[PDB]
Design a protein around this nucleic acid. Structure first.
Lengths: 257, 185, 171
RNA sequence: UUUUUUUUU
RNA sequence: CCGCCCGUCGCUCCUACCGAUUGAAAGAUAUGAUGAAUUGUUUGGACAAGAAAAAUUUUUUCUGGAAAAACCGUAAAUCCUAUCUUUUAAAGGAAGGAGAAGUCGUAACAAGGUUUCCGUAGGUGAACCUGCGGAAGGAUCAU
RNA sequence: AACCUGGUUGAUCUUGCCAGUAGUCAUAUGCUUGUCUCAAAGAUUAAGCCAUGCAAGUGAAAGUAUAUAUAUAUAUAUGUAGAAACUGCGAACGGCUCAUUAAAACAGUUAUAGUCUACUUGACAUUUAUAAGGAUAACUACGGAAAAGCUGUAGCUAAUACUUGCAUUAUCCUUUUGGAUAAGUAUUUGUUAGAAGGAAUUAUAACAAAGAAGUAACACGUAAAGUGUGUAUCAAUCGAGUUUCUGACCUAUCAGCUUUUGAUGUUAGGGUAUUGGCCUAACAUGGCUAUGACGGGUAACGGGGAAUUAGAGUUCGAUUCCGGAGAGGGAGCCUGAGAAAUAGCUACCACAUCUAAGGAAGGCAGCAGGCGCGUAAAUUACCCAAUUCUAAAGAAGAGAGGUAGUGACAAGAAAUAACAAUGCAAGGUUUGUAUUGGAAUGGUGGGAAUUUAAAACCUUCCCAGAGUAACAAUUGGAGGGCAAGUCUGGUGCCAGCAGCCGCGGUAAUUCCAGCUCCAAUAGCGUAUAUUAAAAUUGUUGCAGUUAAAACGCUCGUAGUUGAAUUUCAAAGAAUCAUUCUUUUUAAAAUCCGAUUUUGUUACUUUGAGUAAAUUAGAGUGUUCAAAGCAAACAGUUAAAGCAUUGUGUUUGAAUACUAUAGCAUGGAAUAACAAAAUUGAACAAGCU
RNA sequence: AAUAGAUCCGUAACUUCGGGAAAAGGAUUGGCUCUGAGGACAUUAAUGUUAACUCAGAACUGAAACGGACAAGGGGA
């Protein structure tokens, strides 16, 4: 048969997973869920190789069995569950909240987040659909189908999502002052306010994004994540603060200690 | 199935192996450095030729080039860490002109000879093979170890060596003298 | 079954490898006829049941001028756009020409407007003549092989004129 | 005007 | 130059080519024939379940349904003919090449004793000879 | 390291090849081998055959439990479990091999607005009820044969196996509130309107007809209401099938192919999940081709990748991962979401097992192992401990995978010594050189620690354990290329040696031996292939009078290559004397003295999509290195940082590459194409 | 004895290039219901009078057999 492959080779694992080459030849294939395998990572490596909480699959699973790991305040027991680009995960008894953000190099790193900001999660919508009764339901990048969205919300506008009530709070547009985050582009990891767009005739629309250091970089429209307006990032950024510090002048920063 | 542990080679065959000038120069080098065979004096030129080719590639780039100063500062930092030349030799042209003995001198089997300890380079080599040397907090007995600039200041005799405070002398000889002395007494 | 074992556009023949896979399938055809309304079901790929009809007598038929549809029963097939052997062996396709009883549509017309929404369409003398005769000509549009039911529409106008011109310089 | 030939290193 | 050398004819060995054999073999395509298994449809038609009556039995009706058969359809496999590809047998034939020296002749290298050579044609045991028309790579850069 | 040397001759210079030279993650083999780390390993040929054993199963809150066992107050209610079996999921993953394969597969690049999609997540739904019905296993009792993973009747019971079936919501009006109006989700047909995209016959809405499958007759129990399992529709997830464009080795002693038997397209229809000659019926004669079609060959799976590389290039790529194929060769089919599956079945062909002679059962190109083939390729071992998969998801499995055994495939480190004095040599009391005689270390034996699923190995510490450290290193030569012998004996054109040139008839520097030396070294020769050498395949970058080579000459198609010509320059700030930066200078539409677009393509500059491994490279002392992707920091036991008593911190896995083709992009130069007068224009006025 | 008439297709070695050749070798021809297509005469693009035997496809049907008798090559190396 040629059915769905139920294995993932270690060498074929995505680069940001960072799997040792000698630690076997199989990678934990993420189960079907809210996000794609390439742009999401499993709790296994999240808590074994990134959090360093566990050292083995068996101990990862016996941590997982207890309802102490919560994503969006929802307990999860799928061992290879795709967390996604942007989400809120919580560990209860030790009372910590991790928001999955990017890194300037372009990896996945959990970021410490308080309860208040954890209650404030953002989802980029993908498309809106009209159903029976002339009602519009919009699907986010998290595979989340939220019905009854604001009429002012557009296809590329992002919407504030509340975790408990599962409701929309406020929409953010794609304006020249819209602070965005490149999701899967070659310039992944750099935050920017966008400088302009170019509406091309039926091809991948590109946008030129302006950095804090006046660096202009072009990336596709299909892989951006509006994270707030020009006032401030609505999401607590990681230590690197979303500024792609250059490779040549990274070594001078690294060498002083 | 196949091992994923990458492996490579270090020594390259000199080709036309029967040239007298090159053979005699290699004999000069091995005599002055107290080596054991030709594999090391075939590997070393590969070592100082890899970064020489890197310098060749770097030179043709123009000035104020992002890759050029990047790789230049990286290679120069490695140069100063390994201590091939002093502070006065800083330029890429300066680090291009390297010879065999200067790369050789940073080997332990001659560094310990320069510091003393042994009265011959071969004596130093057999000592370090007999693991009577200490690099400082770390145990080393490989003569081809490349001492950096900062590793030189704490080179001393091995702590577990008999001359480093361990067992004074031959167990059999000491037992024999003590037993003959007690038998006489 | 499809997509191989065929010479290229240049005329050269592609020699066969990659022996036939299941997802190609290519199930055998069906010839729905007039008779007892019994059909089978065929398990399509991905658990998609298909209503396969091999014998049909009654279905739905729509008056397009009035935008209505009534359930009725077919009498016979009289023409198909495909080969005439099909209409000779009494088979139904999605572009066949069949005869439909005029009684239900006439009763609906009398109930709604009378006489022998958007009403008052003045109909046409030819269809009035066919109604007084009692049988009318209409064309099935639904696919009986897939959906398993024979649904059609009443054909009127210049296309009806063309159909009668080709039916009966004529025998 | 006619004149052929000369093992093996 | 008592230099070199050429061929016929001699002996040994090796290689390839032709080869009658309706050559054969092996496969691979196309034709025709037979055609196992089998999708679907139709005809069935062991009963297994229902509905009626008499107070253990029977007629009739409705589905589902196992054997079996027919029809297109997929098509294994076998044979006829044709074509293509790959090896091998083959009596024998005709070559080439290599071997340390063999016989006869003097062909070329000198104006090689008849300048050499080309194309063509004929003759001859062989190298070779001859005719026609060319070239100097000639033995002539020259009344 | 952008490299040459011997050989035509009496001697010389060329062409020219031969030979030498070095590399190969490229194979085999000969000699030899004290250590450690690391580890390819039946591809070549036989995708040949397989004995044997294993390789897919699954129950920890939660489907069904009078086989049965156990515990709480007393035959009463709960339990903990539980063989067999029914039910659910997986078994379509993984592993092996490369036969087929030549615009096919593959690779990059597109679409699916032409489709399907298990588990999961997120939203969510329409036409007897204090809970409905049969239908069966295991089991009981009789057997059959030699048997299958074989099987009959009688009886029974369950389930989340199978099948029936029990409110209410929305809309319009006087206008919180009362009346009236109506009730189909997907899917199909006919008639209309019509947040997004790039274009809808889109979403969706209205009417007229049909219309499945459900909206829980099921199981456990968390806040000091919950969960499991199951279900209609939509979206993503894990994918898959089709699909645009660009790319392939040799061959013309393959020039015309395809088209009744679909070839090229139209119409209509069947079939598929969907488009489609996929197929059928009719219609038309079309489609490809020297830009190499159609054929033929490949000892051709393709790809990133490997070797050699100054740059060009040449050769290889079965094989660590991706994509395709196969499970002896075809063909067919059920099940299942997913197979034309093959440790699933069916039939033939070729093999082959038991046999009471009736009949059954099979595919090691899975892991070990045997036979056959062959120059050539390991153990019929242990473990799920590491990674990962399956399940009813902790405790069970996995010849996946790991570990170990064999293993001079390769690769990395590294033993076979060092030290003081005489004797000698060299030299002005300095270096080497046969004696003594002691320190020091491994190899080795054992014991222990650590280590490991267990064991083994390494490392760590302690005992015996080196003077000919008897605890001993060989391979091939010593005429030239190419270092080491006219050194010594034996043989004497025989033996032999010799990659090439050559040596061998007594003085053999080339044979056979000894000493010595030479090259490498636990490695060194031999054979074949391949790369550079080779500027002897030449685009860079060959040669053609005489060495090989200008067609006998001319015409001429394809191909290649093609005169010039259309917009100049001036002015200003900054490094050292220069260089560098900025503005405009005609016409046409745009803005009330000023607001700004004016070919296509090649080409060229930038970007986004550029899988990993591999490549160069960062940083990082595995005793260095082959490595690998760590680790570092004060801490005989506390200080800082922060938290309103404790809480460790910093970090790395970046970078360029991912065709040449595609997308967007600035573009003045160079190339082409078009508009450019047997006339074609533009402006103004009137006419339609 | 074996087909042998006719239509459609196909036809090798060899060759004197003319042939071999009816090479070899195939299918069909039964029946009736059918259908269609292909000349001369007249009217201000068309409608009326009047004479053929050559093809083709859908049927079913008959005892799956048919140039039905007569009439007629056996081929190949």
């Amino acid at each position: 048969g040629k059915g769905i492959k139920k294995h993932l080779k270690r060498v074929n694992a995505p680069s940001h997973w960072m799997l040792n080459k000698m630690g076997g030849q199989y990678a934990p294939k993420t189960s079907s869920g809210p996000h794609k395998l390439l742009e999401s990572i499993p709790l296994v490596i999240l808590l074994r190789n990134r959090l360093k909480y566990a050292l083995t699959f068996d101990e990862v699973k016996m941590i997982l069995i207890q309802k102490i790991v919560k994503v969006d305040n929802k307990v999860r027991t799928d061992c290879t569950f795709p967390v996604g680009l942007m989400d809120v995960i919580h560990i209860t008894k030790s009372n910590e909240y991790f928001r999955l953000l990017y890194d300037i190099k372009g990896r996945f790193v959990p970021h410490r987040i308080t309860n208040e900001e954890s209650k404030y999660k953002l989802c980029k919508v993908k498309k809106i659909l009209l159903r029976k009764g002339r009602l519009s339901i919009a699907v986010t990048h998290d595979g989340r189908s939220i019905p009854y969205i604001h009429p002012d919300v557009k296809v590329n506008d992002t919407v504030r999502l509340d975790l408990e009530t599962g409701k929309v709070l406020e929409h953010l547009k794609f304006q020249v002052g819209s602070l965005v985050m490149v999701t899967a582009g070659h310039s992944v990891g750099r935050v920017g306010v966008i400088s302009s767009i170019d509406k091309n005739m039926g091809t991948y629309d590109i946008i030129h994004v302006k950095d804090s250091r006046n660096k202009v970089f072009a990336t596709r429209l299909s892989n951006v994540f509006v994270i707030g307006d020009n006032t401030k990032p609505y999401i607590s950024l990681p230590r690197e603060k979303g500024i792609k510090l250059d490779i040549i002048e990274e070594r001078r920063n690294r060498l002083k200690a | 199935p196949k091992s994923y542990r990458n492996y490579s080679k270090t020594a390259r065959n000199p080709k036309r192996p029967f040239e007298k000038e090159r053979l005699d120069q290699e004999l000069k080098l091995i005599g002055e450095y107290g080596l054991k065979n030709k594999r090391e004096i075939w590997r070393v030129q590969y070592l100082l030729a890899k970064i020489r080719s890197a310098a060749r590639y770097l030179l043709t780039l123009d000035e104020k080039s992002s890759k050029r100063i990047f790789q230049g500062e990286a290679l120069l930092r490695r140069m100063v860490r390994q201590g091939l030349l002093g502070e006065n030799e800083e330029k890429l042209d300066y680090v291009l002109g390297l010879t065999l003995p200067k790369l050789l001198e940073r080997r332990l089997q001659t560094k310990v000879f320069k510091l003393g300890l042994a009265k011959s380079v071969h004596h130093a080599r057999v000592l370090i093979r007999q693991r009577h040397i200490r690099v400082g907090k770390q145990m080393v007995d490989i003569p081809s170890f490349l001492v950096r600039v900062d590793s030189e200041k704490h080179i001393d005799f091995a702590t577990t060596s008999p001359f480093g405070g361990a067992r004074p002398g031959r167990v059999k000889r000491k037992s024999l003298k003590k037993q003959k002395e007690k038998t006489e007494a | 079954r499809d997509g191989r074992h065929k010479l290229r556009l240049t005329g050269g023949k592609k020699k066969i490898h990659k022996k036939k896979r299941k997802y190609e399938l290519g199930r055998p055809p069906s010839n729905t006829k007039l008779g007892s309304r019994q059909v089978h079901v065929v398990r399509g790929r991905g658990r998609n049941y298909k209503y396969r009809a091999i014998k049909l007598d009654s279905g739905s038929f729509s008056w397009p001028t009035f935008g209505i549809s009534k359930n009725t029963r077919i009498i016979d097939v009289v023409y198909n756009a495909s080969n005439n052997e099909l209409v000779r062996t009494k088979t139904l396709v999605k572009n066949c020409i069949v005869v439909i009883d005029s009684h239900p549509f006439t009763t609906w017309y009398e109930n709604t407007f009378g006489t022998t929404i958007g009403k008052s369409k003045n109909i046409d003398p030819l269809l009035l003549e066919q109604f007084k005769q009692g049988r009318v000509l209409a064309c099935i549009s639904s696919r009986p092989g897939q959906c398993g039911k024979a649904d059609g529409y009443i054909i009127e106008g210049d296309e009806l004129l063309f159909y009668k011109r080709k039916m009966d310089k004529r025998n």
